Ligand binder design. Structure first.
Ligand SMILES: Nc1ncnc2c1ncn2[C@@H]1O[C@H](COP(=O)(O)OP(=O)(O)O)[C@@H](O)[C@H]1O
Ligand SMILES: Nc1ncnc2c1ncn2[C@@H]1O[C@H](COP(=O)(O)OP(=O)(O)O)[C@@H](O)[C@H]1O
Ligand SMILES: O=P(O)(O)OC[C@H](O)CO
Ligand SMILES: [Mg+2]
Lengths: 514, 514
């Protein structure tokens, strides 16, 4: 009643794993990180060693716990652990060995492209969105199923293991939850399952039409649950993890990374949305207790579900391929600046782009204009154009794509974006947040506790273990402890429209590949 | 006589004047340069002070001569003087005062724009090319006639002097020979006269129809002579020039700057061309003894003429606005490199551009596809693209424009390109020269004695003075005494084809302004 309580969050990302311990204030009190290897066997491919990820996670936990006890020597244990992960990335493993059959292809890996084609033809009958009402997703290389298929066709040990009745497939939550539990648990959560291309969105249940249609035995699928409930206990002793925890610790949170950030930024109400700037962008809008579908090629997905049959919130999702990457490309590919802060400083040093548009579509346009053909392009240059204008044009362009994305989401959902919370690194660029607010015409909230993705999973775990009692208590503790900078709109109807008309014309000149 | 012979060359350019003394081996043995003031009363207006220009030339001659006397014991006198000049620039002066009535509008001056628009519509019925079978020229702000016309309409003293009959109009060649002369010569050479919009190419005589339509009296115009013959004698002693020359020195060569470079590069036979790679490019090809007109907006002009009523060689002329300028923008505006040596170093450091095209139409497209709407554009970029590729693409783009210019010339002229001689600062870029040889499929000759413009005028003078007796002897002395680096084609026709096909696609994306 006096001693502080803690919730652990495993944040398993594309390039590294972290364990963050939160206290009752929603403050990260201990953190450790461990990187894992980005295997690229052929151009366009990306693979991860699933045992390197498991071990990173256990290493992360034992180090973080150790540091925390130095800080609080009166702390016996963590209340619960939550998991949040890079989604779609699929592991295949043996039921008896408990070892992975092969490396895990990663959300953005392109090896499944041919399979993607075979699927669209032979099934959808050339319609990518054929199963969309069922799943929320267009046929794409990203989704699990198509990676499960590739492994079954192209990996000897995976094909064998299926016929023998020992094959377990799983997203990273599932893989982590399996190993952490000693092989005792085989579960996934609704957000992660919404990405398999094997789940029915409205019902949040596996679809026999698809597994069978896609030739994937149901036996290789884990049980689905909500994001906030008992999944299992931590029982493994890898890197002395169970001993560092002291008492058995339940895993009571599981949620995909983009949804975890929605939840960790308190986007509990429809119309609440978040954008995460990293190498790219991922914009998610909470749309309410009923699913919505897209006439603009956006993804329909689960936002969150707190508790077994607690209400389930749904969301729309969009993305931009190069955000941070564009900023870094200007630095390390083009020499336009050296120190990070020069980017903002140079773009502020000019009053606008004065003619030029820079469409930074280095790997094509996604969002509501799928076009793999589009490449990086600059138009309207004169001898007056400088690096300052080009940098400012890159930042405007990011904001312009997100404007387009939100325009679509509004119509596809028929709602107003009440506000946008942002996080990512690129959220540290004040000019970008200003441009973004003017174009969307809503407040942009920049939280100063910048561990919001990892907080999502801790909130799910802590809600189930009774650290926090309700979303209201969650919101209220957040207000008291974790401040945010708020960036309001400040444009003109005519300027906005002039930027957009100019941008629209530039887009027409970007088709290049093939 | 068998003592060393020396020929002098006044090179009167847009920003400076240089006097170069060549010996009989075509070696420049003394050089001096003096700038003149650039006056800009209104944007787009540029004007020169003709007296200042005259004085500079005189100063240049005496300093160059004095330097030579000091360093060469065998130098006694200059056999003859040749003059090469910035063309189109127009001097209005008074026959009795012997001084200018106003400053002289420069070739790139825009004040004649209204007049130009009026002329096309009023005498051209909206066709800018109406007079092009007579002049070889379109209606444009550059040509002398439109500057004369403008002075009469906006300069009271000129309109005044014109009335009294004391008016003298003249391009810089004419002005310099008059002053050097002491007022005893009122002459112009066929090449400069071809840039007035008042000469008939077929006859190489002033055109009454044109003078009447343009309303410039033919009394005000000087007499048209060849490039190489006796024009007059230096009789002034303005900067002690007469004192420095010592003996009587005849002025025996006069030729416009670009044509001078055609001559100094030995392009004596049809199909031989020169390109000057400076801020922009000026490509001229000798098309032979018969004028060739262009159905691609290329200019038809007089190439050269040795001797009074001697054979006259005609030329086609194209230009590109940004060449060296693009190199400078890349460094000054974009920070893509520091020392100009890095430009070629960085472009060499990648094997190609890997699908990007950089169209540097910063000030619109000229050449065979005039389009002032065009702007600087880059297409095809990916995250793998770097400054190295972008620098290389800029170089390719310069070579591709000239490839299209040459292409147009070949179709207009009905002849092949035999070889391309090169000069200008950017002809030091070895890779640019290699890309150009590979695109055109001809040898590129690079003079080590790079003062080609000054040499043209010195050869005209020296041919008329018997320092050299014929064009074959001129060619022999050049080959015997001065080194020519030869750059042979060294790509593949399949690469050529792809580069040209990407270039053509990119051009379509360049239209922006308005
Ligand atoms: N207001 C508080 N009430 C209770 N415990 C706290 C409080 N602030 C910090 N702690 C505990 O102190 C330890 C270190 O927290 P930390 O946030 O690093 O310290 P601080 O915020 O004072 O810089 C953690 O155990 C944290 O739970
Ligand atoms: N060593 C070099 N390597 C590459 N480019 C050069 C080098 N020297 C000069 N340049 C470029 O070539 C141009 C030279 O132009 P120049 O011929 O002197 O003037 P103009 O174009 O008026 O004749 C400059 O703009 C410069 O950018
Ligand atoms: O030859 P310049 O450098 O005087 O330039 C004049 C050109 O003819 C313009 O087209
Ligand atoms: Mg030039």
């Amino acid at each position: 009643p006096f001693t502080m309580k803690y919730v652990g969050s495993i944040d398993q990302g594309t390039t590294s794993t972290r364990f963050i311990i939160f206290d009752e204030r929603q403050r990260p009190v201990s953190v450790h990180q461990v990187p894992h290897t980005q295997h690229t066997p052929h151009p366009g491919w990306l693979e991860h060693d699933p045992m390197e990820i498991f071990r990173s996670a256990c290493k992360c936990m034992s180090v973080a716990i150790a540091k925390l006890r130095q800080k609080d020597a009166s702390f016996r244990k963590i209340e619960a652990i939550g998991i949040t992960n890079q989604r779609e990335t699929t592991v295949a493993w043996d039921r008896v060995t408990k070892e992975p059959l092969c490396y895990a292809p990663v959300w953005n890996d392109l090896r499944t492209y041919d399979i993607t084609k075979k699927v669209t033809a032979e099934l959808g009958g050339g319609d990518s969105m054929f199963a969309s009402k069922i799943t929320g997703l267009p046929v794409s290389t990203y989704f699990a199923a198509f990676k499960m298929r590739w492994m079954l066709e192209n990996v000897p040990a995976v094909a064998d293991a299926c016929r023998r009745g020992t094959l377990c497939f799983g997203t990273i939550d599932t893989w982590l939850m399996y190993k952490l539990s000693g092989g005792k648990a085989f579960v996934t959560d609704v957000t992660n399952a919404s990405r398999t291309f094997l789940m029915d969105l409205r019902t949040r249940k596996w679809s026999p039409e698809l597994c069978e249609k896609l030739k994937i035995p149901m036996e290789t699928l884990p049980e689905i649950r909500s994001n906030s409930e008992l999944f299992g206990y931590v029982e493994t002793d890898e890197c002395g993890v169970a001993a560092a925890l002291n008492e058995r610790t339940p895993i009571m949170g599981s949620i995909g990374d983009q949804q975890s950030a929605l939840f960790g930024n308190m986007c509990f109400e429809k119309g609440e949305a978040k954008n995460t700037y990293g190498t790219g962008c991922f914009l998610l809008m909470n749309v309410g207790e009923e699913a919505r579908f897209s006439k603009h090629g956006l993804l329909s997905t689960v936002g969150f579900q707190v508790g077994r049959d607690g209400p389930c919130y749904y969301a729309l999702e969009g993305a931009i391929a190069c955000a941070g990457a564009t900023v870094e490309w200007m630095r390390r590919n083009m020499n336009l600046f050296s120190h990070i802060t020069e980017c903002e400083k140079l773009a502020r040093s000019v009053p606008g782009t004065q003619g030029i548009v820079f469409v930074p579509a280095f790997s094509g346009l996604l969002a509501p204009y799928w076009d793999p053909s589009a490449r990086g392009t600059i138009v309207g240059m004169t001898l007056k154009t400088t690096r300052a204008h080009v940098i400012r044009a890159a930042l405007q362009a990011i904001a312009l794509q997100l404007n387009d994305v939100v325009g679509s989401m509004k119509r596809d959902a028929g709602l107003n974006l009440s506000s946008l919370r942002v996080d990512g690194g690129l959220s540290k660029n004040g000019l970008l947040m200003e441009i973004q607010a003017s174009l969307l015409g809503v407040d942009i909230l920049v939280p100063s506790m910048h561990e919001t993705t990892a907080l999502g999973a801790a909130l799910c775990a802590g809600l189930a273990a009774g650290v926090w009692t309700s979303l209201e208590e969650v919101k209220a503790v957040s207000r008291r402890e974790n401040s945010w900078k708020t960036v309001s709109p400040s444009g003109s109807a005519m300027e906005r429209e002039a930027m957009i008309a100019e941008w629209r014309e530039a887009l027409k000149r970007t088709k290049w590949a093939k």
